[PDB]
Amino acid sequence: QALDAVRMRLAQLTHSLRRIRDEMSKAELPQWYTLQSQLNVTLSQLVSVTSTLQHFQETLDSTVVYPLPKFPTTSHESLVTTLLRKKNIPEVDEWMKYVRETSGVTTALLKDEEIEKLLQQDREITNWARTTFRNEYGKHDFPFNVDDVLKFTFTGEK
Amino acid sequence: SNQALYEKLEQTRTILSVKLAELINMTTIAVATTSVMMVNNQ
């Protein structure tokens, strides 16, 4: 049900990115309004897909999908492996592990058992910040008649 | 023609400030990457 909209939003994603490809395929870049508009459409599609994806994360994890005997697997085999490859691209996983290394908390603090207190401090600073924004947003506010004259110049009546 | 500068300029100010507060309230809370690009776009 949700993927019926996922395929449409990803279709508009492919169309938008293809339009950006056509705009960038020229020698000189055209106007920036169309570029920024297509980029906003792309971001809207990505956010629209991630929202419904995160909304239905418990249902998709409660089912398995694998092809039926009605499948030409005797001729092509690697393609069927590509269609159901859970393994991410080595760039997203590689830079994902690198970012995990450049996050300020590693597994050495997992051994120390100490994360919920830092999260609590974070949320507290969210409260303080939102209060400061409450105050700082509470500081400011957001002659005559031409026909009669000519009638005098031609007849002399007042 | 000055009223277009009133409405337009004031709208840019409200989008700047309010969008800035929305920014700071979204920096503090693949969801993480979508937060990266939403913050960057703001």
Binding site: E28 | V36, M37
Partner: peptide, 26 residues
Amino acid sequence: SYHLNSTLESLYDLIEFQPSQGVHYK
């Protein structure tokens, strides 16, 4: 997402800011 980020940076490297002419692309 990451690829889009790449494009989003590259275009921002070619922005010419003018108060009377707007944004140009060198």
